[PDB]
Amino acid sequence: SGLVPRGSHMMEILRGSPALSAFRINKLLARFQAANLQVHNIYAEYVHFADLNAPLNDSEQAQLTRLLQYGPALSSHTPAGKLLLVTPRPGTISPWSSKATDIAHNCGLQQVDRLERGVAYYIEASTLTAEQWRQVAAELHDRMMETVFSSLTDAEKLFIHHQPAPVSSVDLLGEGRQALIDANLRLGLALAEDEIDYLQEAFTKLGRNPNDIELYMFAQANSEHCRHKIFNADWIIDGKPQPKSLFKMIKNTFETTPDYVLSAYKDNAAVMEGSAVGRYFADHNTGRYDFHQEPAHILMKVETANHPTAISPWPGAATGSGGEIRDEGATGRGAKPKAGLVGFSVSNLRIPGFEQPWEEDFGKPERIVTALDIMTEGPLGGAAFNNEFGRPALTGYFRTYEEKVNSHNGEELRGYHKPIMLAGGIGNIRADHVQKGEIVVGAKLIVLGGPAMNIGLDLDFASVQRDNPEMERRCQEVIDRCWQLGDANPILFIHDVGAGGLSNAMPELVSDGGRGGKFELRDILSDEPGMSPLEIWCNESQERYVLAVAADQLPLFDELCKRERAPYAVIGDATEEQHLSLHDNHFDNQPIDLPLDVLLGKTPKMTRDVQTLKAKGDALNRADITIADAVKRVLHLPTVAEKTFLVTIGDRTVTGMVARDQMVGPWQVPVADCAVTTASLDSYYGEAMSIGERAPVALLDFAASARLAVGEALTNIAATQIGDIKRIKLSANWMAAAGHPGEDAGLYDAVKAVGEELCPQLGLTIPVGKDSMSMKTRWQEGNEQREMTSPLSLVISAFARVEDVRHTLTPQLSTEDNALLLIDLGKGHNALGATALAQVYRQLGDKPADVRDVAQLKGFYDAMQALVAARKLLAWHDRSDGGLLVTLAEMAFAGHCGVQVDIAALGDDHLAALFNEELGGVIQVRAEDRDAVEALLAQYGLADCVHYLGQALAGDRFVITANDQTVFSESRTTLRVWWAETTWQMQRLRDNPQCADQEHEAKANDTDPGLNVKLSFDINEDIAAPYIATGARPKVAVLREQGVNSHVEMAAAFHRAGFDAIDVHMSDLLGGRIGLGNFHALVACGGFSYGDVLGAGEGWAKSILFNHRVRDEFETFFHRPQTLALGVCNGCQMMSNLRELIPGSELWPRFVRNHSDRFEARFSLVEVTQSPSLLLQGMVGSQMPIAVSHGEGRVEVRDDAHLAALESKGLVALRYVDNFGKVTETYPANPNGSPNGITAVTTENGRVTIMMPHPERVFRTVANSWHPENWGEDSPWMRIFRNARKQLG
Ligand SMILES: Nc1ncnc2c1ncn2[C@@H]1O[C@H](COP(=O)(O)OP(=O)(O)O)[C@@H](O)[C@H]1O
Ligand SMILES: [Mg+2]
Ligand SMILES: [Mg+2]
Ligand SMILES: [Mg+2]
């Protein structure tokens, strides 16, 4: 390896492995050909750069070299052709770097100051000009994050030490107002004239020049983003002063319905009442996991990341989720995220070779990415955060819209060039932590989390975000430790770090407590020593929280952080005086010195004096429309179409509390209308999340669009067992182009429509929300000015306590004798304006849907709740995009059956009856219950809306009649494949196209029987019960490393089998607080230890191997004659890297990147095979589904000799099977490409078993996405843990 001087350090260059699989190489070559770049071949290798602060001895050097060996064993090639090295841009540090460096440090290599990675491309193209070489280089890197170099040694530029930049004053005293004008422009403060006035007067009064940092801080605190001027403005509309702000109209819903609300408008989440259940976690003193019976109340929040996602969509969406997760954990005095939701709105995809007939290219700003790039990289970013942090993503929306329409301001381009990127979720919180505590004078003021870097301050580099989810998981564990101390929780006050960085968050924190603060700049953790005080204080670096703790709790807080490996710094003290001081020990000066009332003082309230514009719609021109062609087009609208590309990329099982995910039934079809989690691992109480949104309707009727968003949230949630509608609480997220003609009045009318009218009438609170007020994009296209302006876009998220998660209905049709009933809350209006139908024929139409009758909407909800509780429904699916046609089609997909329905009672206009998007939906009931159900509906005033349609039938026919006429008839399989083509095409361009194609094609085989089970044992027989009945409970070491996230449910699985589950962190073993000699059983848990950097599980394993003491400890345990060990997912990966310590493991494979090249969150069919594994005794020959959630689960052997030997030794314990029951390598039945379906192996003695899937996530029947109806509480997988208990005796 290379090793050269690098300032006061030395940089080593270490060659890595091949970086690109053959499909990615072929895609690059095909792109060069399409651009007329004659490239003969391309080969890529990873290259690692280690900046060292002191030398490595031979043993250390071998360790570093070994740390940097990871990844799929693709064949090396001797470099040939022109080198183009792609790295992060100078002045940035990749998250890869942060994590790789942490691993080196935890392996004892303190001489490593920083590791960084690039990709060396070797391009053979003898014919190319210097300009064409620049186009080659452009294809190989992301201009917003990366640079291209011509030498490996050029990477020294990434590690240049810069001296701290000093504070700069702005010379108000020496130049007058012009100094502020100049600084406003130079620093991009975006200050209004009255803010310049305010600043001039404040600093004139103080008799000194403002520092840049003080002006920047002020400017971020007074931005529209941060201060919500529009939502607090006075209004005049059509010449009449209005009596309430938009914010006051939202709060009206709380004044009317305070019921069940614990916290609203006083934190960065709302809180509502949950249920008393067993909160499961490890005691501070014992380290033992136990149930704590108490209220688990429910917090909720929804954020957006719309501007950053237009610029750099991966980190935009990633930090959209990451920032919202911090909002959750900083609720109260600390709380715990539980599940997420995700939303996207973008312009037309225009997928190459799959262009749809409504799509027209209208151009876009050069500086933003395309709609397709947002939907490619954005979902991956959001999922990278949710997967690596560890929260399941269980509901969402995805809308495409881009059209030239005759809307409120006449004919113009309306769409989402600036996208909606929405991220939200629910969490749980203890009752005594909901209220923020007092900040005592003298409280210590702390930053918990990541380093600062210069983030948030080519073209828009300031909008390129950066995510490190594992850092935030580390912080969440500290927060967890704190709230888990109950009355001894040392957090007095916590707040997330977001917009404005420390410059907003710390002043907010002290101000919220009625205190001031004094801070020391040089106590803040920084990874960029060149940064100015402005950059340090104001940057928008991620994964940070601020909190206040009493001085006497610092030793406790320090112990908590050190055990989790969460960085923290004490950076100031709360003061009685309401002043803000920031001192700098390096420069011996005071960058900030301000009264808080100056700093947080307000310019006057805004007044918006505006006028109504109302579009007259145009009647839908039906010339080119037929029912058959409409069905085909609508199924091809991404808004309607199957969403799998957004769903399987994100974990849906972490925590073991997910009851209802998006995928429904044996055929795992993503049509669930809402998410449901259990409240704990010991209850059937739970929580539900749904979304309603209908932006295109706002192009015709602003208030109708907002009413439908509320209505649809309710219809999506309605077949979940909740009870009182007042239990349902809403987030309202308002996206608008404020100032665009007609939008401001429209916004006011829409907020009034829901806040003053519909939600109070229904009994719905809106206790949380946000606004994003610049939803438009302008650019120069020809000679012409162009603009793309969003509709007003309200997104409602609904959240509710659930009474019994077991009673949730889905769209999965039964074929027992049945009746299908439409509940048409449209009352026969059958509107077609602003529908999917209209959109797919390039039109807006005339009049949209709306809430037609408030009492009947409420009646619908209550009738559904009565039917759910009485168990009278077989299925439910609501009507939304694509109308009744799509509702029925999606039900037939989920039921893998046909329908025979007649629509003669829905009007003479069959098109309008089928494609209107009025509220309501289809219930399925048992035929014998039809009359009673209809009487029930009639009791709620719905008789007029209720219509018998027909029945679900076995087979493949989707038939719509009207008397004796066939209106539409098609193969259900044909429809289901058309509906899949969008996700097919997205998967195909994003992932391994062979996998995309296999997944797509399997949908066309109607004989697929779906997931099905065969059991070799009695699922209900607790073989551990006689042991448990003795009260003797063996310990299990529940092993976790930093970034592990699946340890709680693992503990709970062993607990149910009779173990005392002990939390054992790798820090515990390294510090002597735990020794494995005291245990007879050990389990290595799932997650993303070190973010999987350096190969999943490798940093964890090598941290053990390279500490001789801990290594010996593991080796001793494994060589004992009676010990048992299990490794699941990340723990399986980890243990596969410890073969040298594990007897009988010599034939084990490696686990590497899935063949799909994508994270796979699947509910996959496996079979238990004959092997020595003691943990699978009694289960051989069983077939049943299991939770899969991994990106590096593919079994990789050295050669066929190794595969054959492993197989002949008989050590394979689980294999993927297809639904026909055969061992398979076809995707996604086998989700990762593992040869012979292998996904678990054991040792020769059967005492150690490792597996990729997660039995601990699905030990509870209620947590199985699909399962046989007759199962009880226990799934088949409970047997693994019971086997471990019995084996111990
Ligand atoms: N952006 C997304 N991320 C994750 N899941 C999503 C996303 N968009 C849609 N889904 C899910 O895919 C399924 C279909 O979504 P959609 O047809 O928009 O729902 P609906 O029409 O019931 O409102 C639902 O289970 C939904 O939660
Ligand atoms: Mg839908
Ligand atoms: Mg729905
Ligand atoms: Mg929807």
Side-chain angles (χ1 to χ4, degrees), residues 139-181:
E139 274 291 341
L140 297 174
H141 82 289
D142 175 350
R143 70 183 182 168
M144 297 310 307
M145 302 192 212
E146 289 171 335
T147 192
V148 187
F149 291 119
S150 292
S151 302
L152 300 187
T153 148
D154 293 344
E156 283 172 36
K157 299 182 211 304
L158 303 180
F159 301 108
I160 288 162
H161 291 138
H162 297 281
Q163 302 281 220
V167 78
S168 175
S169 53
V170 170
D171 193 15
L172 177 62
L173 302 195
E175 304 171 13
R177 194 185 168 89
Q178 193 65 44
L180 299 176
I181 295 167

Side-chain angles (χ1 to χ4, degrees), residues 621-820:
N621 179 348
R622 308 194 180 193
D624 299 336
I625 309 184
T626 66
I627 294 194
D629 184 65
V631 165
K632 197 176 187 168
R633 290 195 189 206
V634 166
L635 299 175
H636 282 85
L637 177 68
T639 312
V640 166
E642 200 174 16
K643 298 309 196 290
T644 313
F645 80 101
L646 300 175
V647 174
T648 63
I649 59 169
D651 191 312
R652 300 183 317 279
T653 57
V654 73
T655 68
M657 292 188 265
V658 178
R660 171 77 281 120
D661 71 308
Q662 295 94 318
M663 312 289 257
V664 160
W667 296 269
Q668 287 288 102
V669 177
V671 294
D673 284 313
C674 73
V676 186
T677 48
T678 67
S680 65
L681 291 164
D682 76 348
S683 189
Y684 301 131
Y685 289 142
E687 301 95 10
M689 308 181 287
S690 68
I691 296 164
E693 61 76 51
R694 211 71 62 83
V697 168
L699 293 181
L700 290 175
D701 186 325
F702 292 99
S705 77
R707 294 187 283 258
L708 292 170
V710 172
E712 191 198 332
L714 206 53
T715 62
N716 263 336
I717 215 172
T720 280
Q721 189 167 350
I722 294 165
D724 178 10
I725 200 174
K726 296 189 181 174
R727 284 277 190 185
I728 299 171
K729 302 307 172 187
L730 315 180
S731 179
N733 284 263
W734 304 88
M735 263 63 64
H740 195 259
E743 299 290 318
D744 291 2
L747 172 64
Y748 192 101
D749 203 54
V751 173
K752 183 180 187 183
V754 302
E756 290 290 312
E757 293 166 10
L758 180 69
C759 294
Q761 296 172 272
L762 293 174
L764 295 176
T765 319
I766 312 175
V768 70
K770 206 162 179 172
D771 62 286
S772 182
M773 289 288 103
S774 57
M775 296 298 292
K776 57 83 171 42
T777 282
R778 290 166 157 124
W779 69 107
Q780 284 275 147
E781 187 46 55
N783 291 316
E784 331 137 32
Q785 263 302 317
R786 285 239 157 154
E787 186 179 37
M788 181 66 63
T789 302
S790 291
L792 170 78
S793 304
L794 170 54
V795 180
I796 290 289
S797 302
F799 305 100
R801 166 193 188 271
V802 174
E803 175 65 40
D804 190 339
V805 304
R806 299 173 294 178
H807 297 165
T808 298
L809 290 318
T810 71
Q812 181 191 165
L813 296 176
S814 180
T815 58
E816 77 194 87
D817 295 340
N818 68 279
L820 302 172

Side-chain angles (χ1 to χ4, degrees), residues 260 262 271-277 294-299 428-429 679 685-687 727 800-802:
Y260 313 107
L262 295 180
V271 184
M272 60 187 174
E273 294 181 60
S275 297
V277 295
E294 63 193 37
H297 294 310
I298 307 160
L299 69 85
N428 291 316
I429 190 168
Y685 289 142
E687 301 95 10
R727 284 277 190 185
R801 166 193 188 271
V802 174

Side-chain angles (χ1 to χ4, degrees), residues 202-276:
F203 286 94
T204 303
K205 280 183 183 142
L206 291 167
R208 72 144 170 114
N209 277 336
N211 289 330
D212 53 4
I213 172 175
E214 294 169 313
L215 296 181
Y216 206 93
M217 172 170 53
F218 181 96
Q220 305 315 121
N222 287 277
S223 70
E224 183 68 28
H225 192 262
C226 277
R227 184 156 294 281
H228 302 104
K229 292 175 196 162
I230 294 165
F231 270 64
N232 292 293
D234 291 339
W235 291 75
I236 302 169
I237 304 187
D238 294 328
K240 299 188 174 169
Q242 305 295 118
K244 284 181 183 194
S245 65
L246 300 185
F247 189 40
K248 181 67 162 165
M249 289 192 290
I250 298 296
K251 288 166 172 164
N252 182 245
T253 69
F254 175 74
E255 292 160 2
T256 301
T257 309
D259 305 54
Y260 313 107
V261 175
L262 295 180
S263 182
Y265 319 126
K266 66 170 179 34
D267 212 331
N268 313 226
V271 184
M272 60 187 174
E273 294 181 60
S275 297

Side-chain angles (χ1 to χ4, degrees), residues 8 34 62 134 138 218 346 369 378 446 504 584 587 654 667 778 847 886 1049 1063-1064 1122 1177 1202 1209:
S8 64
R134 273 141 33 217
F218 181 96
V346 295
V369 302
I446 289 166
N504 191 12
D584 186 341
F587 287 121
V654 73
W667 296 269
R778 290 166 157 124
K847 299 219 96 74
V886 167
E1049 58 269 28
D1063 177 26
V1064 179
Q1122 290 317 328
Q1177 178 286 326
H1202 175 190
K1209 196 65 179 150

